[PDB]
């Protein structure tokens, strides 16, 4: 992952500025696992670079016990003669989502592999993703519009924690620290947000009046 000295030297020779590819960051909290994965897989095949965060807060319909049992049935499948080379049962929730997307992809083609490698999965929100830009959601894969609220539902992090995932507490503490840092920084800059809001308000009295009338016509003033 570390760039080669040749690549750093070429970048210095060209004098190019810092570059970031067009990447969509999806917050997977309260998102249905299969519906989000199907949507993500289609977008990956269409050529989008997608990074998903908070994978541990994905949701699966039904009780946690039956979802844990379903994974345990998946875990029991292994090549008897040689468990190495057998199915690799990843426990991390981000790895669970990646496997679900992978099964929805044609993983045995170069095109399918390119789509799969265009996806990055995280538990929680890592610092390199926090400040990159506004996160997105999938409206047709959201719990509050997909599940009937009476039905019990499973949280992916809780399901994974009891089937082998060992970093549930680490992710929870990191998420707690991140929200506290974000809340403090959002408590700050409120004066900046309020000042800009008042600046826009005062602009109406200083700008040409026919321009105001156009704004009122199109519902902006």
């Amino acid at each position: 992952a570390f760039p080669s000295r040749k690549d750093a030297f070429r970048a210095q020779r060209k004098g190019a500025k810092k570059h970031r590819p067009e990447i969509i960051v999806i917050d997977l909290k309260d998102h249905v696992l299969g519906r989000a994965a199907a949507v993500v897989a289609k977008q990956l095949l269409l050529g989008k670079k997608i990074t998903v965060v908070r994978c541990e807060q994905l949701n699966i319909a039904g009780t946690e016990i039956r979802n844990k049992i379903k994974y345990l049935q998946y875990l029991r499948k292994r090549k008897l003669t040689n468990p190495t080379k057998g199915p690799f049962h990843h426990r991390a929730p981000s790895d669970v989502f990646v496997r679900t997307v992978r099964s929805m992809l044609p993983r045995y083609t170069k095109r399918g592999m390119k789509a799969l490698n265009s996806l990055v999965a995280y538990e929680g929100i890592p610092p390199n993703v926090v400040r990159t830009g506004g996160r997105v959601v999938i409206p047709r894969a959201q719990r509050h519009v997909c599940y009937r609220s009476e039905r019990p539902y499973t949280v992916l992090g809780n399901m994974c924690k009891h089937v082998g995932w060992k970093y549930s507490d680490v992710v929870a503490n990191l998420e707690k620290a991140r929200v506290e840092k974000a809340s403090r920084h959002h408590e700050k800059q409120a004066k900046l947000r309020d000042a800009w809001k008042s600046a826009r308000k005062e602009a109406l009295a200083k700008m040409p009046k026919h321009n105001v009338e156009v704004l009122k016509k199109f519902g902006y003033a």
Binding site: I24, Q43, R135, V136
Partner: protein
């Protein structure tokens, strides 16, 4: 949606002959998707009741009876359906609807859902609008209250087709991918 079953009146008779110089004329009410199905049901009923085949009969008329003005009503639908296990089972149900065709179409949907009865094993004995005080089921009479009011909860409001999006920002309306 508008009902999928139209109200048909089929008037027919056995073709005149020497034994029956003036055959009796029969009028039939049926709820069918089209007039071809309506004539088929009429000739079936003539065969099983009046012993008259379509090959020896005439169809005087087959016309749709229009629905009345749409008013929230209570319809008493007397219906029957066949099953191998139980033979002919007849029930009298009540529905809330605005038309005879809507109430009958609702009854057919109810029979399919709750008894796995298809259209061709169902016979509609009668259907009529009934007053509020003649309704027996509380699930129907609960809509007769003068102050019926309730909120709209657990609703999945889907945007207009042109404005639907795949990826939208978390707390905005800005479509990232549409």
């Amino acid at each position: 949606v508008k009902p999928h079953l139209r109200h048909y009146q089929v008037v027919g008779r056995e073709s005149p002959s020497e034994k029956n110089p003036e055959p009796t004329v029969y009028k039939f009410e049926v709820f069918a998707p089209n007039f071809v199905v309506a004539k088929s049901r009429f000739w079936r009923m003539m065969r099983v009741k009046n012993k008259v085949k379509a090959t020896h009969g005439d169809v005087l008329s087959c016309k749709v009876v229009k629905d009345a003005k749409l008013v929230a009503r209570n319809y008493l639908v007397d219906i029957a359906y066949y099953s191998q296990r139980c033979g002919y089972t007849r029930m009298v149900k009540e529905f809330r609807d605005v038309s005879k065709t809507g109430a009958v179409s609702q009854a057919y949907h109810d029979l399919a859902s709750r008894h796995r009865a298809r259209y061709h094993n169902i016979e509609v004995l009668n259907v009529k609008s009934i007053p509020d005080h003649e309704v027996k089921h509380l699930s129907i009479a609960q809509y007769h209250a003068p102050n019926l009011s309730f909120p709209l909860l657990q609703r999945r409001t889907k945007a207009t087709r042109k404005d639907r999006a795949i990826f939208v920002k978390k707390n905005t309306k800005r479509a990232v991918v549409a």
